[PDB]
């Protein structure tokens, strides 16, 4: 029966899922024109890119 | 505490270069404003005087 260590499996599964979603949150656009800081710095002026 | 007044005459259309985070001929060769600049900019037409 492989479902005996389900709790210990789900612990690390939730940990990996939290890590993955924390990594994916970097691709989010929190009201900005792009998710990359270098692109915003190269496109807009510092007063507007702030 | 310490207030300083600068005086210079440009060709008119270059007024956008006198600002923090701006680039150009005058901004990079003649007069540059820092990103942490705290002051006021006063510019008016002088086609009748200069």
XYZ file of N, CA, C and O in Angstrom:
400
model
N 0.839 -1.189 0.000
C 0.000 0.000 0.000
C 0.876 1.242 0.000
O 1.588 1.484 0.987
N 0.866 2.051 -1.063
C 1.704 3.258 -1.084
C 1.113 4.442 -0.337
O 1.812 5.449 -0.163
N -0.141 4.359 0.107
C -0.813 5.468 0.769
C -0.669 5.428 2.288
O -1.526 5.969 2.997
N 0.392 4.803 2.801
C 0.592 4.747 4.245
C 1.263 6.005 4.780
O 0.940 6.451 5.887
N 2.185 6.588 4.017
C 2.909 7.796 4.412
C 2.323 9.039 3.757
O 3.054 9.953 3.357
N 0.995 9.071 3.617
C 0.345 10.183 2.945
C 0.564 11.519 3.624
O 0.710 12.539 2.951
N 0.594 11.536 4.957
C 0.807 12.791 5.673
C 2.211 13.333 5.425
O 2.387 14.521 5.119
N 3.223 12.473 5.560
C 4.597 12.894 5.309
C 4.807 13.280 3.852
O 5.657 14.126 3.553
N 4.048 12.676 2.934
C 4.142 13.081 1.536
C 3.495 14.442 1.312
O 4.068 15.306 0.637
N 2.307 14.655 1.881
C 1.597 15.914 1.707
C 2.321 17.083 2.359
O 2.197 18.209 1.874
N 3.076 16.845 3.433
C 3.851 17.927 4.039
C 4.831 18.515 3.026
O 4.803 19.718 2.733
N 5.704 17.671 2.468
C 6.677 18.159 1.501
C 6.010 18.587 0.201
O 6.525 19.478 -0.484
N 4.860 18.003 -0.151
C 4.137 18.471 -1.328
C 3.640 19.900 -1.146
O 3.780 20.728 -2.052
N 3.066 20.207 0.020
C 2.627 21.570 0.298
C 3.811 22.524 0.367
O 3.718 23.668 -0.092
N 4.934 22.075 0.935
C 6.126 22.920 0.962
C 6.604 23.249 -0.450
O 6.900 24.412 -0.760
N 6.679 22.239 -1.320
C 7.112 22.468 -2.694
C 6.122 23.344 -3.448
O 6.525 24.187 -4.256
N 4.823 23.169 -3.195
C 3.824 24.000 -3.858
C 3.929 25.452 -3.408
O 3.788 26.373 -4.222
N 4.181 25.675 -2.116
C 4.386 27.032 -1.625
C 5.629 27.662 -2.235
O 5.598 28.834 -2.630
N 6.725 26.906 -2.330
C 7.919 27.425 -2.991
C 7.644 27.763 -4.453
O 8.069 28.818 -4.942
N 6.921 26.889 -5.158
C 6.638 27.121 -6.570
C 5.766 28.352 -6.770
O 6.023 29.158 -7.670
N 4.729 28.522 -5.945
C 3.885 29.700 -6.098
C 4.598 30.975 -5.662
O 4.357 32.033 -6.253
N 5.500 30.898 -4.678
C 6.301 32.064 -4.327
C 7.249 32.450 -5.453
O 7.505 33.641 -5.661
N 7.775 31.465 -6.184
C 8.591 31.773 -7.355
C 7.733 32.378 -8.461
O 8.126 33.359 -9.104
N 6.547 31.810 -8.694
C 5.669 32.301 -9.751
C 5.133 33.697 -9.468
O 4.797 34.419 -10.413
N 5.037 34.091 -8.195
C 4.575 35.437 -7.868
C 5.493 36.522 -8.418
O 5.073 37.680 -8.511
N 6.732 36.180 -8.780
C 7.622 37.167 -9.381
C 7.163 37.561 -10.779
O 7.408 38.691 -11.214
N 6.500 36.651 -11.491
C 5.989 36.937 -12.824
C 4.721 37.779 -12.806
O 4.209 38.120 -13.878
N 4.208 38.121 -11.629
C 2.994 38.914 -11.529
C 3.286 40.382 -11.817
O 4.392 40.877 -11.584
N 2.276 41.076 -12.331
C 2.361 42.498 -12.649
C 1.468 43.244 -11.660
O 0.280 43.454 -11.908
N 2.054 43.646 -10.533
C 1.304 44.335 -9.490
C 1.035 45.781 -9.881
O 1.622 46.706 -9.310
N 0.147 45.986 -10.854
C -0.188 47.315 -11.316
C 0.859 47.982 -12.179
O 0.673 49.144 -12.559
N 1.948 47.293 -12.503
C 3.010 47.865 -13.314
C 2.851 47.460 -14.776
O 2.009 46.636 -15.138
N 3.686 48.059 -15.629
C 3.641 47.752 -17.054
C 4.393 46.472 -17.392
O 4.173 45.901 -18.468
N 5.271 46.006 -16.509
C 6.032 44.787 -16.750
C 6.470 44.217 -15.409
O 6.494 44.912 -14.392
N 6.819 42.930 -15.424
C 7.279 42.238 -14.229
C 8.793 42.265 -14.069
O 9.297 41.826 -13.030
N 9.525 42.762 -15.063
C 10.979 42.848 -15.011
C 11.367 44.269 -14.631
O 10.906 45.234 -15.254
N 12.215 44.400 -13.608
C 12.640 45.726 -13.170
C 13.574 46.380 -14.178
O 13.526 47.601 -14.364
N 14.428 45.590 -14.837
C 15.343 46.150 -15.825
C 14.595 46.744 -17.011
O 14.985 47.800 -17.521
N 13.519 46.090 -17.454
C 12.732 46.631 -18.559
C 12.083 47.955 -18.176
O 12.060 48.896 -18.978
N 11.559 48.050 -16.953
C 10.937 49.293 -16.505
C 11.982 50.396 -16.380
O 11.722 51.556 -16.722
N 13.179 50.055 -15.897
C 14.235 51.055 -15.774
C 14.741 51.513 -17.136
O 15.134 52.675 -17.289
N 14.742 50.623 -18.130
C 15.237 50.990 -19.452
C 14.181 51.703 -20.288
O 14.530 52.459 -21.201
N 12.899 51.480 -20.001
C 11.830 52.094 -20.778
C 11.433 53.464 -20.236
O 11.423 54.448 -20.981
N 11.109 53.544 -18.951
C 10.651 54.781 -18.337
C 11.790 55.478 -17.602
O 12.807 54.872 -17.255
N 11.603 56.773 -17.371
C 12.550 57.557 -16.600
C 12.451 57.201 -15.120
O 11.430 56.679 -14.666
N 13.507 57.454 -14.350
C 13.485 57.138 -12.913
C 12.305 57.770 -12.189
O 11.660 57.088 -11.378
N 11.975 59.054 -12.430
C 10.819 59.624 -11.711
C 9.519 58.878 -11.957
O 8.692 58.767 -11.043
N 9.314 58.359 -13.166
C 8.120 57.577 -13.458
C 8.286 56.106 -13.104
O 7.314 55.462 -12.687
N 9.496 55.563 -13.247
C 9.718 54.159 -12.919
C 9.683 53.917 -11.415
O 9.542 52.769 -10.980
N 9.817 54.976 -10.609
C 9.756 54.809 -9.160
C 8.393 54.306 -8.705
O 8.316 53.508 -7.765
N 18.083 76.061 4.815
C 19.426 76.103 5.385
C 20.412 76.753 4.421
O 21.039 77.767 4.744
N 20.559 76.179 3.229
C 21.439 76.711 2.194
C 20.702 76.652 0.863
O 20.415 75.563 0.355
N 20.390 77.819 0.305
C 19.659 77.931 -0.951
C 20.579 78.560 -1.990
O 21.203 79.595 -1.729
N 20.669 77.927 -3.158
C 21.509 78.401 -4.248
C 20.664 78.570 -5.501
O 19.771 77.763 -5.774
N 20.952 79.624 -6.261
C 20.227 79.942 -7.484
C 21.177 79.835 -8.669
O 22.236 80.470 -8.680
N 20.795 79.033 -9.660
C 21.574 78.849 -10.876
C 20.898 79.576 -12.030
O 19.666 79.651 -12.092
N 21.706 80.113 -12.942
C 21.207 80.869 -14.082
C 21.875 80.372 -15.355
O 23.106 80.333 -15.439
N 21.060 80.000 -16.339
C 21.560 79.563 -17.636
C 20.424 79.638 -18.643
O 19.250 79.477 -18.295
N 20.789 79.883 -19.899
C 19.832 80.053 -20.988
C 20.042 78.930 -21.993
O 21.167 78.703 -22.452
N 18.958 78.239 -22.340
C 19.012 77.142 -23.299
C 18.142 77.478 -24.503
O 17.506 78.537 -24.547
N 18.107 76.579 -25.486
C 17.374 76.807 -26.726
C 15.870 76.594 -26.584
O 15.177 76.515 -27.604
N 15.352 76.496 -25.363
C 13.920 76.404 -25.157
C 13.374 74.994 -25.071
O 12.811 74.606 -24.043
N 13.530 74.213 -26.141
C 12.986 72.860 -26.164
C 13.743 71.897 -25.259
O 13.280 70.768 -25.062
N 14.883 72.307 -24.708
C 15.684 71.455 -23.841
C 15.332 71.608 -22.366
O 16.091 71.139 -21.512
N 14.206 72.252 -22.047
C 13.804 72.403 -20.653
C 13.471 71.063 -20.010
O 13.567 70.928 -18.785
N 13.081 70.065 -20.805
C 12.787 68.747 -20.256
C 14.043 68.018 -19.797
O 13.937 67.040 -19.049
N 15.223 68.470 -20.225
C 16.467 67.826 -19.826
C 16.926 68.240 -18.434
O 17.708 67.510 -17.815
N 16.464 69.380 -17.932
C 16.838 69.834 -16.580
C 15.815 69.217 -15.634
O 14.811 69.823 -15.249
N 16.080 67.969 -15.248
C 15.222 67.205 -14.353
C 15.952 65.945 -13.904
O 16.801 65.427 -14.641
N 15.666 65.432 -12.709
C 16.330 64.202 -12.257
C 15.977 63.020 -13.150
O 14.821 62.832 -13.535
N 16.992 62.226 -13.484
C 16.791 61.040 -14.289
C 16.670 61.278 -15.775
O 16.224 60.377 -16.495
N 17.051 62.454 -16.261
C 16.966 62.783 -17.675
C 18.341 62.704 -18.329
O 19.376 62.896 -17.686
N 18.333 62.415 -19.628
C 19.552 62.301 -20.414
C 19.458 63.210 -21.631
O 18.373 63.637 -22.034
N 20.610 63.500 -22.211
C 20.686 64.359 -23.372
C 22.037 65.044 -23.430
O 22.974 64.671 -22.730
N 22.114 66.061 -24.291
C 23.359 66.810 -24.431
C 23.621 67.681 -23.209
O 24.666 67.553 -22.561
N 22.685 68.572 -22.880
C 22.859 69.456 -21.732
C 22.826 68.666 -20.430
O 23.554 68.980 -19.481
N 21.988 67.629 -20.364
C 21.846 66.869 -19.126
C 23.117 66.101 -18.789
O 23.418 65.877 -17.612
N 23.880 65.693 -19.804
C 25.061 64.873 -19.571
C 26.372 65.632 -19.726
O 27.415 65.123 -19.300
N 26.354 66.826 -20.316
C 27.582 67.563 -20.581
C 27.668 68.910 -19.883
O 28.777 69.358 -19.584
N 26.541 69.570 -19.616
C 26.546 70.926 -19.082
C 25.970 71.007 -17.674
O 26.633 71.514 -16.764
N 24.746 70.525 -17.465
C 24.073 70.654 -16.174
C 23.256 69.397 -15.921
O 22.381 69.052 -16.721
N 23.534 68.719 -14.812
C 22.838 67.500 -14.428
C 22.241 67.657 -13.036
O 22.870 68.229 -12.140
N 21.016 67.149 -12.861
C 20.350 67.155 -11.568
C 20.374 65.763 -10.949
O 20.090 64.775 -11.636
N 20.708 65.651 -9.666
C 20.748 64.332 -9.029
C 19.352 63.759 -8.838
O 18.343 64.467 -8.879
N 19.309 62.441 -8.627
C 18.031 61.768 -8.422
C 17.371 62.195 -7.118
O 16.142 62.146 -7.001
N 18.164 62.614 -6.130
C 17.652 63.086 -4.850
C 17.554 64.607 -4.794
O 17.684 65.200 -3.718
N 17.330 65.250 -5.937
C 17.229 66.702 -5.975
C 15.958 67.170 -5.279
O 14.881 66.593 -5.455
N 16.088 68.229 -4.482
C 14.970 68.816 -3.746
C 14.990 70.322 -3.986
O 15.737 71.052 -3.327
N 14.177 70.782 -4.927
C 14.128 72.198 -5.227
C 13.038 72.504 -6.227
O 12.124 71.705 -6.436
N 13.148 73.677 -6.846
C 12.180 74.140 -7.829
C 12.903 74.576 -9.094
O 14.046 75.041 -9.048
N 12.224 74.421 -10.227
C 12.741 74.825 -11.530
C 11.852 75.932 -12.074
O 10.626 75.774 -12.149
N 12.466 77.051 -12.450
C 11.757 78.211 -12.980
C 12.318 78.512 -14.360
O 13.519 78.774 -14.504
N 11.454 78.477 -15.373
C 11.860 78.725 -16.750
C 10.784 79.533 -17.456
O 9.601 79.184 -17.392
N 11.196 80.605 -18.129
C 10.281 81.463 -18.866
C 10.912 81.833 -20.201
O 12.106 81.624 -20.429
N 10.092 82.389 -21.088
C 10.554 82.767 -22.415
C 11.354 84.062 -22.351
O 10.982 85.007 -21.649
N 12.458 84.099 -23.093
C 13.331 85.263 -23.164
C 13.732 85.542 -24.604
O 14.872 85.923 -24.891
N 12.796 85.354 -25.537
C 13.072 85.640 -26.939
C 13.220 87.132 -27.202
O 13.794 87.516 -28.228
N 12.720 87.977 -26.304
C 12.822 89.420 -26.464
C 14.087 89.999 -25.850
O 14.468 91.123 -26.195
N 14.745 89.263 -24.956
C 15.913 89.753 -24.236
C 17.216 89.137 -24.724
O 18.148 89.864 -25.081
N 17.306 87.809 -24.749
C 18.539 87.101 -25.090
C 18.532 86.586 -26.523
O 19.070 85.512 -26.807
